[PDB]
Enzyme design. Sequence first.
Site, PDB file in Angstrom:
ATOM      1  N   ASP A 109      11.748   5.196 -20.930  1.00 22.15           N
ATOM      2  CA  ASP A 109      10.356   5.345 -21.335  1.00 22.15           C
ATOM      3  C   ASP A 109      10.237   6.382 -22.459  1.00 22.15           C
ATOM      4  O   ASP A 109      11.239   7.001 -22.853  1.00 22.15           O
ATOM      5  CB  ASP A 109       9.497   5.744 -20.137  1.00 22.15           C
ATOM      6  CG  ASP A 109       9.770   7.174 -19.653  1.00 22.15           C
ATOM      7  OD1 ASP A 109      10.949   7.573 -19.521  1.00 22.15           O
ATOM      8  OD2 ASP A 109       8.790   7.903 -19.403  1.00 22.15           O
TER       9      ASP A 109
ATOM     10  N   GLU B 218       4.834  22.221 -28.020  1.00 27.01           N
ATOM     11  CA  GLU B 218       4.800  21.005 -27.233  1.00 27.01           C
ATOM     12  C   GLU B 218       3.843  21.196 -26.059  1.00 27.01           C
ATOM     13  O   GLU B 218       3.042  20.297 -25.740  1.00 27.01           O
ATOM     14  CB  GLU B 218       6.200  20.736 -26.693  1.00 27.01           C
ATOM     15  CG  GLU B 218       6.344  19.422 -25.931  1.00 27.01           C
ATOM     16  CD  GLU B 218       7.717  19.319 -25.322  1.00 27.01           C
ATOM     17  OE1 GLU B 218       8.015  20.109 -24.399  1.00 27.01           O
ATOM     18  OE2 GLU B 218       8.509  18.472 -25.787  1.00 27.01           O
TER      19      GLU B 218
ATOM     20  N   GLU C  77      11.740   9.694 -21.971  1.00 25.02           N
ATOM     21  CA  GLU C  77      13.201   9.649 -22.006  1.00 25.02           C
ATOM     22  C   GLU C  77      13.803   9.962 -20.640  1.00 25.02           C
ATOM     23  O   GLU C  77      14.885  10.539 -20.569  1.00 25.02           O
ATOM     24  CB  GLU C  77      13.771  10.608 -23.065  1.00 25.02           C
ATOM     25  CG  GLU C  77      12.932  10.671 -24.344  1.00 25.02           C
ATOM     26  CD  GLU C  77      13.684  11.307 -25.487  1.00 25.02           C
ATOM     27  OE1 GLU C  77      14.486  10.610 -26.131  1.00 25.02           O
ATOM     28  OE2 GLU C  77      13.448  12.500 -25.753  1.00 25.02           O
ATOM     29  N   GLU C  78      13.113   9.555 -19.576  1.00 26.19           N
ATOM     30  CA  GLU C  78      13.471   9.950 -18.213  1.00 26.19           C
ATOM     31  C   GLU C  78      13.632   8.757 -17.265  1.00 26.19           C
ATOM     32  O   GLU C  78      14.459   8.789 -16.365  1.00 26.19           O
ATOM     33  CB  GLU C  78      12.396  10.879 -17.633  1.00 26.19           C
ATOM     34  CG  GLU C  78      12.301  12.228 -18.335  1.00 26.19           C
ATOM     35  CD  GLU C  78      11.025  13.007 -18.005  1.00 26.19           C
ATOM     36  OE1 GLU C  78      10.017  12.419 -17.537  1.00 26.19           O
ATOM     37  OE2 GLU C  78      11.040  14.237 -18.247  1.00 26.19           O
TER      38      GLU C  78
ATOM     39  N   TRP D  16      22.527  10.576 -23.452  1.00 28.99           N
ATOM     40  CA  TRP D  16      21.082  10.584 -23.641  1.00 28.99           C
ATOM     41  C   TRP D  16      20.506   9.378 -22.903  1.00 28.99           C
ATOM     42  O   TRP D  16      21.248   8.441 -22.585  1.00 28.99           O
ATOM     43  CB  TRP D  16      20.730  10.526 -25.137  1.00 28.99           C
ATOM     44  CG  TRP D  16      19.356  11.086 -25.398  1.00 28.99           C
ATOM     45  CD1 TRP D  16      18.229  10.385 -25.722  1.00 28.99           C
ATOM     46  CD2 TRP D  16      18.964  12.464 -25.311  1.00 28.99           C
ATOM     47  NE1 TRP D  16      17.154  11.245 -25.846  1.00 28.99           N
ATOM     48  CE2 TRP D  16      17.578  12.524 -25.599  1.00 28.99           C
ATOM     49  CE3 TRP D  16      19.646  13.655 -25.012  1.00 28.99           C
ATOM     50  CZ2 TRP D  16      16.862  13.732 -25.611  1.00 28.99           C
ATOM     51  CZ3 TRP D  16      18.931  14.856 -25.020  1.00 28.99           C
ATOM     52  CH2 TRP D  16      17.546  14.877 -25.311  1.00 28.99           C
TER      53      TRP D  16
END
Length: 599
Positions: free
Chosen positions: A176, A404, A179-180, A120
Amino acid sequence: SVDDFISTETPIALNNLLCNVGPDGCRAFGTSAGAVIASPSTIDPDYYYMWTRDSALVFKNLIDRFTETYDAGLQRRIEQYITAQVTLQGLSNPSGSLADGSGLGEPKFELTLKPFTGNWGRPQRDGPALRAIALIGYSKWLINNNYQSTVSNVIWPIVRNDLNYVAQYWNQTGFDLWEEVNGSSFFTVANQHRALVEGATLAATLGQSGSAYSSVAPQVLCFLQRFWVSSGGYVDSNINTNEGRTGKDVNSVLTSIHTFDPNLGCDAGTFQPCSDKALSNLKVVVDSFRSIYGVNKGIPAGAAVAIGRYAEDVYYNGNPWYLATFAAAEQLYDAIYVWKKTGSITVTATSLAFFQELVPGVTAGTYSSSSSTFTNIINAVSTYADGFLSEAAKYVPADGSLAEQFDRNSGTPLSALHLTWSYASFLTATARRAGIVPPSWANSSASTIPSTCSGASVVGSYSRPTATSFPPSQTPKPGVPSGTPYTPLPCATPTSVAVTFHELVSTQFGQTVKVAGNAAALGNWSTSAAVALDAVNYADNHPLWIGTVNLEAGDVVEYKYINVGQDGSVTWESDPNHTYTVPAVACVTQVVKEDTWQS
Ligand SMILES: *[C@@H]1O[C@H](CO)[C@@H](O[C@@H]2O[C@H](CO)[C@@H](O)[C@H](O)[C@H]2NC(C)=O)[C@H](O)[C@H]1NC(C)=O
Ligand SMILES: *[C@@H]1O[C@H](CO)[C@@H](O)[C@H](O)[C@H]1NC(C)=O
Ligand SMILES: *[C@H]1O[C@H](CO)[C@@H](O)[C@H](O)[C@@H]1O
Ligand SMILES: *[C@H]1O[C@H](CO)[C@@H](O)[C@H](O)[C@@H]1O
Ligand SMILES: *[C@H]1O[C@H](CO)[C@@H](O)[C@H](O)[C@@H]1O
Ligand SMILES: *[C@H]1O[C@H](CO)[C@@H](O)[C@H](O)[C@@H]1O
Ligand SMILES: *[C@H]1O[C@H](CO)[C@@H](O)[C@H](O)[C@@H]1O
Ligand SMILES: *[C@H]1O[C@H](CO)[C@@H](O)[C@H](O)[C@@H]1O
Ligand SMILES: *[C@H]1O[C@H](CO)[C@@H](O)[C@H](O)[C@@H]1O
Ligand SMILES: *[C@H]1O[C@H](CO)[C@@H](O)[C@H](O)[C@@H]1O
């Protein structure tokens, strides 16, 4: 009308938000007490985890609601969320352990409150900041209601670990909020600054040590200034990275709304919603989406549009997000609040483009509440803000559900269903519209920027919190607005429940996991009739097998997982049988049973 949408959507959004909170929420039933699922989606995508960030943003909203009007039902959930953090902070996980604080940077966990072992984007250093902010929020309420001892004994040890983390690790790169991107991120730094400021204040009130926090905070604020692009009039949302994006990202808008404090007025140093820098950035960010989404076709300049995260986005092809579109409205409502309160609006060279799009021909200057210009601006900005709400509203289905994303061309919902953060974002935007603002976090000095910056940090000390319970009936003091406990929306009681078996078991090529059990749907222990699970979410270091069976509500079922080889040979997991009572609860139509192979 917008008003009609708000009145209809509000009880649905609140209901659906609370459905995602364990142990009893209608879509999180049987999860750990105080857990928050990001979404009940378990396949394409699998969001069935607890993120520190989403959970803290959601509970900040609930704590703010609760502060406005006492609700013993919310209080119960808040208490359980807080005590869940005792378990989580103690966990050794792939980011590290509590011993040196590194484990606190871990982005997400299993809903059993165990570590997520898969690969992750870790660490994410906003998590401890956001969690501290939520817990400090509740602490404020306890203190005002003469329960300061509860703060010192239960809450402060948790908060102190998160604050120490921020003071120690702020000057380090990480992922960030999307999550990238591994770098230094605006949202993360700004929230780290806020956390340290509130932490120092709480420490002083408790007579605990806070000087480390107050000495580091101005340096965090110092660094925050470096994200501004003066030539473009916007925030470059991630720096110290080589990602090759413009940096125009709803990251910066979310930052403005989540660190909003009307007592700071239109302070540009902390990027307040009505600050000239925040207003310029908003326009630049919105503009980056106007020409690229099919849903925005035909909408003129000066009118609201659907917005996404960032224009370069390719996640599910890159689409508008509800929370991003609501965030634009919220920043504007926050700006309107401050303008009305102070009775004055200043237009500067930096914010001129923003204002001229809404009030053609207006020039730089200060306009007081008596001026026609003031009234013109207020009306124009209010209409524009409502426009963002109405644009999102076009793409909310009849049942009021918020996924989302919504498709950039057709507006149909996609990605994770019932995203908890989508519901929170609707609730906060509409609260600001009605002039409901959160407690202040800053004093004037929390905006003073040091002359020279350094990467000043403090190595902290970490200890496992031990207190896991609150005193009963911590009711408000006489004179505080108080109401009846929250009750969920009513539903029929189902006769059948979709039970998603969610099993972690390491398997080798050619093996299949099935679930065998006493119920007819589970095959009455016949290995030939056992229900095969899918390896759709399987990874070697997160060996998840999943599948769904309809079972009769109320039924007591016994089951075991089996591993079936290429040759048809069957391996049963070790004793004992799992025993599960299928819920028979109004509104609970789908549950997830999280198991791990019994060795
Ligand atoms: C750690 O903090 C320092 C001090 O604020 C940061 O250094 C600045 O970095 C920016 C962007 O690269 C430069 O524009 C400044 O000139 C730097 N200032 C100094 C005094 O070095 C640094 O980026 C921070 N690093 C992390 C990972 O947070
Ligand atoms: C379950 O299977 C067993 C055979 O082991 C059999 O005795 C029994 O009749 C079955 N029960 C049901 C519900 O059919
Ligand atoms: C949290 O856990 C403690 C024991 O560690 C209990 O005393 C408390 O009641 C709560 O379950
Ligand atoms: C404390 O008292 C309240 C009533 O105000 C109860 O609801 C609660 O169960 C606890 O005993
Ligand atoms: C809230 O009310 C309760 C009664 O349930 C008191 O025990 C408490 O002191 C507070 O006033
Ligand atoms: C404040 O008052 C309300 C009802 O007026 C109660 O339900 C609540 O428990 C609190 O005492
Ligand atoms: C369906 O049945 C259940 C019984 O447990 C009720 O709690 C619910 O309100 C609905 O009537
Ligand atoms: C689940 O637990 C029950 C306890 O009643 C057992 O009967 C069953 O075999 C399974 O272990
Ligand atoms: C689910 O709950 C029921 C009622 O408590 C039990 O009978 C069953 O064994 C399982 O624990
Ligand atoms: C089971 O069905 C209900 C509606 O009947 C949903 O609200 C729930 O999410 C689940 O799919």
